[PDB]
Symmetry: C3
Subunit: 130 residues, 3 copies
């Protein structure tokens, strides 16, 4: 039984791994909020999805990419006019081998997160085990 | 076999439970469009997701939160400039006990729904049964 | 084991089937990038989701609808002000019979896709087999 769901707590900005520190669900404890990464324990097929809230008045361009280790497997850009919020979101279905790390990276832009209201999220679960 | 998928039909606005009355899928009949709520029958792990379309020229701020009973478990805000649409969307993975209610609440803002075209949606399914 | 995940490569615009030609995952080879369609082989319950990136400065209105054969089962509209990107996204849970085709159609608007960076995506998997 492998499944997790976490949210973002503070304001996030610049190139970095988005660490979702508000962990709601984490069967098997495979998501590490100190790294922001999901580690594959069982070879198989996995679904992942993320929703990242962006602040307006921020230059204006926020990138949030789902990575499998060092490879971009999904991308999203958020960007809005006068003073406004928007979402950079995407979903994947990937095959993973034990040790593979899955996580969201922030490239530039202002990402909003709340103490415990989960406007920005990261979740996933295994669909098939090999 | 627990899974549902419903859409929104009319214009929705103000604080209220978003009742998705255009039900496409509803295995086990656990989603009630007269309440807009999904009721857990089987203890286990559940995935939920929602996409809510917002109208522009509307003041401009629409909140749509997924709730498990009286608790906010996911949030989204939509908001756009001159005359424009956008989405408040999010996804969760939650553990539920029999009786738990899962649903979307609208906080302020103009939510669009169509008679039978499903621009605004609510869906979910059980991943693991305890 | 039925699951797929594909992205969009070039710029897409006008009424047409969105062919996601950057296929990452495709168990059972049921997604055809030459048609852009997923063909049901096994009667059962299926989850689908799509994220379509739209360019700003484009008139400004992009529609992307998930279709089951010739029927609209989900809709999304993207639309943004000065020079800006946004997403038309939605998710479904549907019952399918062998032969049913599931795919995204583009109605008007500028859809962005990248050679191999997957800003615009299409994915899905079977939840229950009948
Ligand atoms: Mg990228
Ligand atoms: Mg809230
Ligand atoms: Mg926008
Ligand atoms: Mg948006
Ligand atoms: Mg979305
Ligand atoms: Mg339509």
């Amino acid at each position: 039984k492998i499944a997790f769901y976490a949210g973002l707590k503070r304001q996030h900005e610049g190139y970095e791994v988005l660490k979702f520190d508000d962990v709601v669900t984490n069967l098997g404890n495979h998501y590490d909020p100190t790294t922001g990464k999901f580690t594959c324990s069982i070879p198989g097929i996995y679904f992942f999805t993320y929703h990242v809230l962006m602040r307006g008045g921020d230059g204006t361009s926020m990138w949030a990419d789902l990575c499998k280790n060092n490879q971009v497997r999904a991308s999203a850009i958020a960007q809005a006019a006068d003073q406004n919020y928007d979402y950079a979101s995407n979903s994947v279905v990937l095959h993973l081998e034990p040790g593979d790390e899955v996580y969201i990276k922030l490239d530039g832009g202002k990402a909003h997160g709340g103490n415990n209201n989960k406007y920005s999220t990261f979740s996933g679960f295994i669909i098939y085990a090999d």
